[PDB]
Amino acid sequence: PEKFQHILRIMNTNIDGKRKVGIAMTAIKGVGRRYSNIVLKKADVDLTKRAGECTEEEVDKVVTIISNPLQYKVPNWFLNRQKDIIDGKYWQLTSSNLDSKLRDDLERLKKIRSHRGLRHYWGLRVRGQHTKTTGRR
Amino acid sequence: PEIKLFGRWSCDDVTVNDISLQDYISVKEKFARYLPHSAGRYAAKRFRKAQCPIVERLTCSLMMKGRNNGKKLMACRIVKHSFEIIHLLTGENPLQILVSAIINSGPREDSTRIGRAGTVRRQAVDVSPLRRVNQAIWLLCTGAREAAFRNIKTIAECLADELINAAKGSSNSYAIKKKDELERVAKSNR
Amino acid sequence: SGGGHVAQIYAIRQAISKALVAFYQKYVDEASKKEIKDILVQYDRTLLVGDPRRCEPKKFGGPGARARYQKSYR
Amino acid sequence: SVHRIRITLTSRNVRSLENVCRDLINGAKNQNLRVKGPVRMPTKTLRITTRKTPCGEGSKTWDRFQMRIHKRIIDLHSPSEIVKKITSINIEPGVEVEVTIA
Amino acid sequence: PVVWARVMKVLGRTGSQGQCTQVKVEFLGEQNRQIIRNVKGPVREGDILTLLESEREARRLR
Amino acid sequence: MGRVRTKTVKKAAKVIIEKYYTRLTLDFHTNKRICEEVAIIPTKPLRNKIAGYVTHLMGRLRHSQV
Amino acid sequence: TGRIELYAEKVAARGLCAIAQAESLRYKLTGGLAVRRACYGVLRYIMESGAKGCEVVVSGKLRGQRAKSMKFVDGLMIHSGD
Amino acid sequence: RDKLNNQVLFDKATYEKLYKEVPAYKLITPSVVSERLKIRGSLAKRALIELREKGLIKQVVQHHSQVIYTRATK
Amino acid sequence: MPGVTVKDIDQHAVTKAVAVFLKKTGKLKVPDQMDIVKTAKFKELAPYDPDWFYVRCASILRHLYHRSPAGVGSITKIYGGRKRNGVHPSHFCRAADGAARKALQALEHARLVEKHPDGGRKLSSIGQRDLDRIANQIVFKQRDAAKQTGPIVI
RNA sequence: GAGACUCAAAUAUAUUAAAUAGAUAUCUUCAGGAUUAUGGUGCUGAAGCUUAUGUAUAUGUAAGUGGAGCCGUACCUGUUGGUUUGUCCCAUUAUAAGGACACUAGCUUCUUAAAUGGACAAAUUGCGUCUAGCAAUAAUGAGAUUGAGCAAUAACAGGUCUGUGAUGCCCUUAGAUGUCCUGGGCUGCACGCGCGCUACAAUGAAAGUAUCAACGUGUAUUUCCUAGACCGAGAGGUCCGGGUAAACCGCUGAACCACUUUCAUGCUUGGGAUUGUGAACUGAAACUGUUCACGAUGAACUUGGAAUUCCCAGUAAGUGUGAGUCAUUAACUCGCAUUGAUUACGUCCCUGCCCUUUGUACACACC
I138 CB-contact burial (10 Å; exposed 0-12 / middle 13-18 / buried 19+):
buried
Taking the Cβ of residue C45 and every Cβ of chain B, the question of whether any pair is shorter than 8 Å is answered with yes
Would you say I40 and I52 are in contact if contact means Cβ atoms under 8 Å apart?
no
Helix (H) or strand (E) holding B57: helix B54-62
CA distance B8 to B95: 11
CA distances to D80, D83, H57 from D1, in Å: 9, 12, 87
Nucleotide lying nearest to G80, CA to C1' measure: J151
Backbone angles phi, psi at B9, to 5 degrees: -120, 130
Would you say C33 and C40 are in contact if contact means Cβ atoms under 8 Å apart?
no
Do H29 and B87 make contact, defined as CB atoms within 8 angstroms? no
Which residues of chain B form beta strands (DSSP E)?
109-112, 123-126
CA distance B16 to B103: 8
Q: Are strands E48-51 and E3-14 parallel, antiparallel or unpaired?
A: antiparallel
Q: How close E9 gets to chain B, by Cα (Å)? A: 13
Nearest CB to H29: which of B78, B87, B157?
A: B157
> Is residue F18's beta carbon less than 7 angstroms from any atom in nucleic acid strand J?
no
* One-letter amino acid for residue A136 of the chain: R
CA distance D101 to E1: 96
Do H61 and B155 make contact, defined as CB atoms within 8 angstroms? no
Q: Which residues of B touch C39 (CB under 8 A)?
A: 2
Sorted by sequence, the CB contacts under 8 Å of residue C4 that are 6+ apart come out as none
> Is residue A99's beta carbon less than 7 angstroms from any atom in nucleic acid strand J?
no
Sorted by sequence, the CB contacts under 8 Å of residue B112 that are 6+ apart come out as B122, B123, B125, E15, E17, E19, E20, E40
Sorted by sequence, the CB contacts under 8 Å of residue B10 that are 6+ apart come out as B4, B93, B95
DSSP state of E60: -
Do E47 and B47 make contact, defined as CB atoms within 8 angstroms? no
CA distance C42 to C25: 20
CA distance A31 to A98: 11
Q: Which of B106, B112, B52, B104 is nearest to E48 (CA)?
A: B106
Do H10 and A1 make contact, defined as CB atoms within 8 angstroms? yes
CB burial of A101-134 (b: ≥16 within 10 Å; e: otherwise) equals eeeeebeebeeeeeebbeebeeeeebeeeeeeee
Q: Which of F14, F48, F13 is nearest to F33 (CA)?
A: F48
Side-by-side strand order, sheet with B109-112? B109-112, B123-126, E34-39, E20-27, E3-14, E48-51
CA distance I149 to I154: 8
CA distance A72 to A74: 6
Q: Which of I12, I83, I97, I70 is nearest to I42 (CA)?
A: I83
Q: Which nucleotides of J are covered by protein (CB under 7 A)?
A: 1-6, 8-12, 16-19, 21-22, 30-35, 57-58, 75-80, 93-97, 112-115, 117-124, 131-137, 139-155, 157-160, 162-163, 187-217, 226-236, 241, 246, 249-279, 287-289, 293-298, 300, 302, 308-321, 323-324, 330-347, 349, 351-352
Do B128 and E16 make contact, defined as CB atoms within 8 angstroms? no
Q: Which of E50, E48, E42 is nearest to E21 (CA)?
A: E42
Question: Angle G35-48/G19-31 helices, nearest 10 degrees?
Answer: 160
* Neighbour subunits, H (≥3 Cβ pairs < 8 A): A, B
Helices (H), F1-66: 7-20, 28-38, 44-62
Would you say D41 and D71 are in contact if contact means Cβ atoms under 8 Å apart?
yes
Sorted by sequence, the CB contacts under 8 Å of residue A94 that are 6+ apart come out as A11, A28, A29, A30, A31, A66, A67
Sorted by sequence, the CB contacts under 8 Å of residue E43 that are 6+ apart come out as B128, B129, B130, E7, E10, E21, E23
B44 CB-contact burial (10 Å; exposed 0-12 / middle 13-18 / buried 19+):
exposed
Q: Which of H14, H2, H68, H20 is nearest to H40 (CA)?
A: H14
Helices (H), C1-74: 5-26, 30-43
Would you say B50 and B31 are in contact if contact means Cβ atoms under 8 Å apart?
no
Q: Which of A82, A93, A88, A115 is nearest to A32 (CA)?
A: A93
CA distances to B19, D30, E12, E26, E35 from E8, in Å: 16, 77, 13, 6, 10
Compute the C-alpha angle H29/H30/H31, nearest 5°: 90
Nucleotide lying nearest to A117, CA to C1' measure: J287
Would you say B27 and B14 are in contact if contact means Cβ atoms under 8 Å apart?
yes
Residue of B nearest to C11 (CA): B39
CA distances to B149, D95, H31, H34 from B154, in Å: 9, 68, 7, 12
> Is residue A135's beta carbon less than 7 angstroms from any atom in nucleic acid strand J?
yes
Would you say F52 and F31 are in contact if contact means Cβ atoms under 8 Å apart?
yes
CA distance H19 to H39: 15
From the centroid of its chain, how far is CA A39? 12
CA distance C53 to C40: 20
Would you say D96 and D10 are in contact if contact means Cβ atoms under 8 Å apart?
yes
Question: CA neighbours within 13 Å on the CB side: how many for A62?
Answer: 25
In chain I, residues 37 through 56 whose Cβ sits under 7 angstroms from any atom of nucleic acid strand J? 37-41, 43-49, 52, 55-56
Determine how many CB atoms are found less than 10 A away from the CB of residue H5. 9
Helix (H) or strand (E) holding D84: helix D80-88
* One-letter amino acid for residue A71 of the chain: Q
Q: How far is the CA of B71 from the C1' of J272 (A)?
A: 26
Backbone angles phi, psi at I84, to 5 degrees: -95, 100
Residue of D nearest to C69 (CA): D60
Q: Which of D25, D14, D20 is nearest to D70 (CA)?
A: D14
Sorted by sequence, the CB contacts under 8 Å of residue E41 that are 6+ apart come out as B127, B128, B130, B131, E19, E21
B90 CB-contact burial (10 Å; exposed 0-12 / middle 13-18 / buried 19+):
middle
Nearest CB to A34: which of I32, I33, I45?
A: I45
Sorted by sequence, the CB contacts under 8 Å of residue A124 that are 6+ apart come out as A131, A135
CA distances to B92, B164, H58 from B79, in Å: 17, 13, 19
Question: CA neighbours within 13 Å on the CB side: how many for B140?
Answer: 37
> Is residue C16's beta carbon less than 7 angstroms from any atom in nucleic acid strand J?
no
Q: How far is the CA of B4 from the C1' of J157 (A)?
A: 77
CA distance B86 to G42: 87
Helices (H), chain A: 21-24, 36-42, 56-67, 97-112, 115-121
Helix (H) or strand (E) holding E6: strand E3-14
Sorted by sequence, the CB contacts under 8 Å of residue I135 that are 6+ apart come out as I5, I6, I7, I14, I18
Compute the C-alpha angle A125/A129/A135, nearest 5°: 65
3-state secondary structure chain I: CCCCCCCCCCCCHHHHHHHHHHHHCCCCCCCCCCCCCCCCCCCCCCCCCCCCHHHHHHHHHHHHHHHCCCCHHHHHHHCCCEEECCCCCEEECCCCHHHHHHHHHHHHHCCCCEEECCEEEECCCCHHHHHHHHHHHHHHHHHHHHHHHCCCCC
CA distance F41 to F48: 9
Nearest CB to B128: which of E15, E17, E42?
A: E42
After which residues is chain G discontinuous, taking C to N > 2.5 Å?
none
Would you say D13 and D94 are in contact if contact means Cβ atoms under 8 Å apart?
yes
Would you say G71 and G55 are in contact if contact means Cβ atoms under 8 Å apart?
yes
Determine how many CB atoms are found less than 10 A away from the CB of residue C42. 10
Which residues of D15-89 form beta strands (DSSP E)?
39-40, 44-51, 62-77
Question: Angle B54-62/B72-89 helices, nearest 10 degrees?
Answer: 120
Q: Determine the 3-state secondary structure of B56 from DSSP.
A: helix
Do B129 and E48 make contact, defined as CB atoms within 8 angstroms? yes
* One-letter amino acid for residue I123 of the chain: L
Helices (H), H1-74: 12-21, 30-35, 43-51
CB burial of A58-84 (b: ≥16 within 10 Å; e: otherwise) equals bbebbbebbbebeeeebeeebbeeeee
- Interface B–H counts its CB contacts (< 8 A) at 52
Q: Determine the 3-state secondary structure of D48 from DSSP.
A: strand
Would you say B44 and B126 are in contact if contact means Cβ atoms under 8 Å apart?
no
CA distance B144 to B64: 12
CA distances to A11, B104, C69, F11 from B164, in Å: 54, 11, 44, 66
> Is residue I126's beta carbon less than 7 angstroms from any atom in nucleic acid strand J?
no
Taking the Cβ of residue B123 and every Cβ of chain E, the question of whether any pair is shorter than 8 Å is answered with yes
Helix (H) or strand (E) holding A95: none
Determine how many CB atoms are found less than 10 A away from the CB of residue I128. 21
Q: How far is the CA of I116 from the C1' of J260 (A)?
A: 36
Residue of E nearest to B183 (CA): E52
Q: Which residues of D touch C67 (CB under 8 A)?
A: none
From the centroid of its chain, how far is CA B110? 18
Q: Which residues of B touch H41 (CB under 8 A)?
A: 152
CA distances to D32, D36, I99 from D4, in Å: 14, 12, 51
Q: Determine the 3-state secondary structure of G13 from DSSP.
A: coil
Backbone angles phi, psi at D83, to 5 degrees: -65, -60
Helices (H), B92-173: 94-105, 132-150, 155-167
DSSP state of A26: G
Beta bridge partners of A72: none
> Is residue I150's beta carbon less than 7 angstroms from any atom in nucleic acid strand J?
no
Q: How far is the CA of G76 from the C1' of J151 (A)?
A: 14
CA distance I122 to I68: 6
CA distance E44 to E48: 9
Taking the Cβ of residue C14 and every Cβ of chain B, the question of whether any pair is shorter than 8 Å is answered with no
List, as own/partner pairs, every contact residues A93-101 make where C-beta atoms lie below 8 angstroms and the sequence separation is at least 24, other chains included. Answer: A93/A30, A94/A11, A94/A28, A94/A29, A94/A30, A94/A31, A94/A66, A94/A67, A95/A11, A95/A12, A95/A13, A95/A28, A95/A29, A95/A30, A96/A11, A96/A12, A96/A29, A97/A30, A98/A29, A98/A30, A99/A29
Taking the Cβ of residue I33 and every Cβ of chain A, the question of whether any pair is shorter than 8 Å is answered with yes
Would you say I92 and I106 are in contact if contact means Cβ atoms under 8 Å apart?
no
Resolution of the experimental structure, in angstroms: 6.0
Q: Is the dihedral of CA H43, H45, H49, H51 positive or negative?
A: positive
CA distance A40 to A46: 8
Determine how many CB atoms are found less than 10 A away from the CB of residue H74. 4
Q: Which of A67, A21, A26 is nearest to A41 (CA)?
A: A21
CA distance D100 to D6: 6
Sorted by sequence, the CB contacts under 8 Å of residue B36 that are 6+ apart come out as B6, B53, B55, B56, B58, B59, B75, B76, B79, B80
Would you say B149 and B155 are in contact if contact means Cβ atoms under 8 Å apart?
no
Q: How close A135 gets to chain H, by Cα (Å)? A: 30
* One-letter amino acid for residue G4 of the chain: I
In chain I, residues 61 through 80 whose Cβ sits under 7 angstroms from any atom of nucleic acid strand J? 62-63, 66-75, 77-80
CA distance C12 to B185: 52
Beta bridge partners of D74: D7
Determine how many CB atoms are found less than 10 A away from the CB of residue I66. 13
Residue of H nearest to A16 (CA): H5
Determine how many CB atoms are found less than 10 A away from the CB of residue B167. 24
Would you say E23 and E38 are in contact if contact means Cβ atoms under 8 Å apart?
yes
Question: Angle B174-188/B94-105 helices, nearest 10 degrees?
Answer: 30
Q: Which residues of D touch C60 (CB under 8 A)?
A: 60-62
Q: Determine the 3-state secondary structure of D76 from DSSP.
A: strand
CA distances to A79, F38, I138, I152 from I148, in Å: 53, 81, 15, 8
CA distances to B22, B39, B50, B95 from B56, in Å: 17, 11, 11, 12
CB burial of B7-33 (b: ≥16 within 10 Å; e: otherwise) equals bebebeebebebebbbbbbbbbeeebb
Q: What is the dihedral of CA I100, I104, I106, I109, to 10 degrees?
A: -170
CA distance B71 to G59: 59
In chain A, residues 23 through 82 whose Cβ sits under 7 angstroms from any atom of nucleic acid strand J? 23, 26, 28-35, 48-49, 75, 77-82
Nearest CB to B39: which of C10, C42, C43?
A: C10
Residues on D contacting C at a C-beta cutoff of 8 Å:
59-62
From the centroid of its chain, how far is CA A123? 23
